[PDB]
Amino acid sequence: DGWVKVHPTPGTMLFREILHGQLGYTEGQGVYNVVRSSEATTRQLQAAIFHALLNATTYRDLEADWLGHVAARGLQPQRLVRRYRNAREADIAGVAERVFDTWRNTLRTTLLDFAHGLVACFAPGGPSGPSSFPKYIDWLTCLGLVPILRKRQEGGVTQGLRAFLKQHPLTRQLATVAEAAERAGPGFFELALAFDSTRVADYDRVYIYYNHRRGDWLVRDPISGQRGECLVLWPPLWTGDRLVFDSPVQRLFPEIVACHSLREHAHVCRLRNTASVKVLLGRKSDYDIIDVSKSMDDDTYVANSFQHPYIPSYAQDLERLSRLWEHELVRCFKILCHRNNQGQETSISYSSGAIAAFVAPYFESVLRAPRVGAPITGSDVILGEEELWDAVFKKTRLQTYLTDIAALFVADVQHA
Amino acid sequence: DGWVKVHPTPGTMLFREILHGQLGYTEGQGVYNVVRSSEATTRQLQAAIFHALLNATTYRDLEADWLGHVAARGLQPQRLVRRYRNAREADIAGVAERVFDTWRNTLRTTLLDFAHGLVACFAPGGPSGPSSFPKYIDWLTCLGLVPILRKRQEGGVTQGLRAFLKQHPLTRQLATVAEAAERAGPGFFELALAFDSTRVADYDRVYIYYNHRRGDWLVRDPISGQRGECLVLWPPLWTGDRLVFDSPVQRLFPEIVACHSLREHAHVCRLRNTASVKVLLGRKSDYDIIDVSKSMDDDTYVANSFQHPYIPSYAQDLERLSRLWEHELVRCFKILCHRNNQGQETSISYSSGAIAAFVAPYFESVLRAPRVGAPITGSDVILGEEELWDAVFKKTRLQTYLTDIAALFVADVQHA
C-alpha cells in the first residue's frame, strides 16, 4: 500500500562499501578520516562541564574560605603590621600580594584537578557505545538520515558519576567545591542519563520504510522488534519508482562508477597484448596466438586485415577524481585547513561553522542534552584541554571575585 | 482553456536531478554546497534578538539596581571614605572603579546567558521544518519561483517561547530584565507565529499553473487540496511555444547536456576498440571481430577499405564546464572568497550585498516577519556568537547608561 523499502536495498549497501574503498581508493578520500574524528564533541563537552561548574560558585564561600585561610595562618593585617612596625608600604603590599597569589594558585590547581576528574567519566561514551558520534557522521554521509532508538534506564555513565561524586574529599575540604558540586550535580545526572539512554542504530541491522503520500518515516529494529524514531537532516526526493538522496556519496556516485569501469576495461586490454605474435588463417580456393577463422569461409575470400593495439589511459581520471573527492568533502563539511608559507596542511580541523552546524544538532536532537551554554569557537578545538580550562577561567565569573577580594585585601592591609 | 501546466513537466524534474549530479559532477558545482547553508539567517536572527532585548532596557531601573547592589554591600561612598580616612583620592577612585567593573562584568555575563537562552528557541526552525531556508534557495536556483502555503496556528516555537519565558528566574532577580523581557515578549511571540504559520511547498508534491493572457499564478497542493501563493523573483518569458525561465540551471543547461552527450559518445567509441585484429571478407568473383559482407555483393567488386580508430577526448570540456559553474554561481549569488598570500579559498562567505538581496526578502516577504532592525554586514557572518553579542552590546543604550553611571559614581566618591 504505497510503502517502499528504502535502506536494506543493495544500492545503499553499495554506498556504504564504497565508503570502505571496496571499489577503488584515492588520496582525496583520505580526508574523510578527519571528518569522523570525535575531538570536537569532547571539546564541547569539556567546555560545558567547565562552564557548569565554575558558574555555580559564589562570592560568599570564596570570601569565607579566604578569611579561614588567613585566620589559620594567623596572618591578619593588624598582626602583620604590628610585627613589622615600619611604614614601608611597598614591602607589605608585595608580601600580601604574594600570599594571596599562593592561595589563588593552589585553589586554581585544586579546582582544575576536580574538573578533570569530572570530565573523565563522560569522555568514553562520546566516541563509542550508545550515541557514538562517528556512526552518526557516516550515517549522514551515506543518506542524511539518522535512525535513532530510545529507552529510559540507568546505566554506565550514571553509575560512574554516582561512584565519583559521593565520596570525593575535595567537596568536604572546601566550601566552594561543596556548594558548586551540590548545585551542579543534578544537571550532570540529567546529562549522564541523556548519554546512557539513546543509541544510534547499526547500519547492517536496521530497516527503514518510506511512504510518499504522507511523507512518513517508519524505522524498525528487526532483532528486538523495537520501533525507532527517524531523523532527516537533508530531505530526499521522490521521482516515481526511485528515491534520490542528496548525500555526498550520491552526488559523487555516477562518477566513481565510470572511473572504475574504465579501470576494469584498461585491465582487460592489457592482458590481451601479452602475446606478441599473432597469426591469421583462412581457407584455400578449391605467447603466440592463432586465430582460426576457417569455420566461416565458404565461397568467400579474405579482403583485408588490420591491427591496432589500443590501451586506455586512466591516470588523468584518477587525479580528477581525487581532487573532486577532496573539494567535495572540504566544502560540504566546512573543514578548515592551515598552511605553511608555501607548504600545505599543517593541520586539519573543524571550522566554527562546522561545529555550530553539526555538533549542535547532535547534542540537541540526537542526545536531547539539557544545555551546553554558549558553543566553543573553532580555534578552541586546536587548544589542549588544559588551555581550554585556563581560557574559560579567564573570562568567567570566578576571576572577578578573586580580583575584587585581592584588591580589597591589599587596600585594607595598607589602611589598617 | 488557455492555461499552461508548468512545474511537473519532465524538464523541470530534469533540472533538479541535474542539481543532484544525475548527469556528471564537477569541482565547480561543489561551491553550491556553501550557497545552501543557513549560517547567515541564524546570524541575522541572533542579531535581531540581541537588538530587541538590549533596546528594551531603561536607565532608571538600572540605576536602582546599581544602588541596590551598593546598599547590599554596604559600601556607600560616605562609609568607605569615613573608613579609610585619607586624602589619596586616586586609590579610592580606583577601588570604586574596580567595584563597578566587577558589577558590570557580572551584568554582562548574566545578560549574555539570558540572550543565548532566548535564541535557542528559534534557531532549529530555520534549517528544517516549516520555512526551511535551503529549500527556498534550491527553489530559486531551479526556477526563480517559490510556492508558499499558509495557515494561522500556534505550534512548536510558540510553545517553546511560552515555556521558556514564564519559568525563567532572571525576571524575578532583576527588575531591568523583568521590564525588558515584558516589553520584548510580544514581538517574540509575533515572530514565533510568523515562523510557525508559513510553509514552503515540497518540490515533488506541488502543482503550478500559468496563464499568459492574465499574467497571474496558481499554485495547488494536490494531496491536501490547499491553495497557495507564489513569489516570483526573476520573472520568466513566454515565447509562445514554451516557457523559459532565467534561473542559473536554465542558462547552464545546454552546456552540461552537450558535455554529457560527448562523454557518452566517447564511452561508446572506447568499447569499439577492444578487439585488436579485424578481418574483412568478400564474395568470390564466381579479441578478433569478423565483418561479413557476403550478402550485399552482386554485380560488384571491392575497391578499397580504410581504417581510422577515432576516440573523442573530453577533459578540456570538463575543465571548461567546472570553471563555468564556479564563476556562474559566484557572480550570481554574490558569494565572496577569502584567500591566503597566494593560496586560494581559505574560506567562503556571503557578501553584504548577498545577504541584503537574499536574506532580507526571505524575512520580509516569505516569512512576513515583523521587523529585523538594521541588517548585519557581510563581515559579521564570520564572527562567532560571542563576538556578535559583544559588537551589538558595545554600541547601544546600555553602554551609554553604564558609563554615565560609572563616571558619576566615581566623581561623586572622590568629590565627597
Residue numbers in the entry:
A (entry chain d), B (entry chain e): 24 to 27, 29 to 310, 494 to 623
Q: Paper's wording?
A:
Three capsid types have been recognized from the nuclei of herpesvirus-infected cells: empty A-capsids, scaffolding-containing B-capsids, and DNA-filled C-capsids. A unique portal vertex exists at a 12th I5 vertex through which the genome is translocated during assembly. Here, portal proteins assemble into a dodecameric basket-like structure that is thought to seed the assembly of scaffolding proteins, in turn driving the formation of spherical procapsids composed of MCP, SCP, and triplexes. A separate protein complex, the terminase, associates with the dodecameric portal and initiates genome packaging and the concurrent autoproteolytic cleavage of the scaffold.
To improve the resolution of the portal baskets, we carried out separate sub-particle reconstructions and refined them while imposing C12 symmetry, leading to portal basket structures at resolutions of 3.6, 3.5, and 3.7 Å for the A-, B-, and C-capsids, respectively. Additionally, an “anchoring” segment of the scaffold protein is resolved interacting with the portal baskets of A- and B-capsids but not D- and C-capsids. The C12 reconstruction of both A- and B-capsid portal baskets revealed a small hook-like density with large aromatic side chains and sharp turns wedged into a hydrophobic pocket between the crown domains of each portal monomer. This density is weaker in A-capsids, but still conspicuous, whereas it is completely absent in C-capsids, D-capsids, and mature virions. Indeed, we found the scaffolding protein residues 449–455 (PYYPGEA, numbered relative to pUL26) to be a good fit for the small density. Based on our model, P452 interacts with the essential residues W127 and L131 (both adjacent to W90) from the first portal monomer, whereas Y451 forms a hydrophobic interface with Y83 and Y608 from the second portal monomer. Furthermore, E454 from the scaffolding appears to stabilize Y608 via hydrogen bonding, buttressing the hydrophobic interactions between the three aromatic residues. Our A-capsid portal reconstructions still contain scaffolding hook densities, although with weaker density than in B-capsids, suggesting low occupancy, but even residual presence of the scaffolding protein suggests that these capsids were likely never fully packaged with genome, as full genome content in the capsid lumen should displace the portal-bound scaffold. A- and B-capsids varied in portal height by ~2 and ~1 nm, respectively, could rotate up to 13 degrees relative to the capsid shell, and exhibited up to 1 nm of portal basket “sway,” due to flexibility between the clip and nearby wing and stem domains. Our analyses of portal basket variability revealed that non-mature A- and B-capsid portals permit more rotational flexibility than mature-state C-capsid portals, which may be important for the dynamic process of genome packaging, during which torque is applied to the genome substrate.
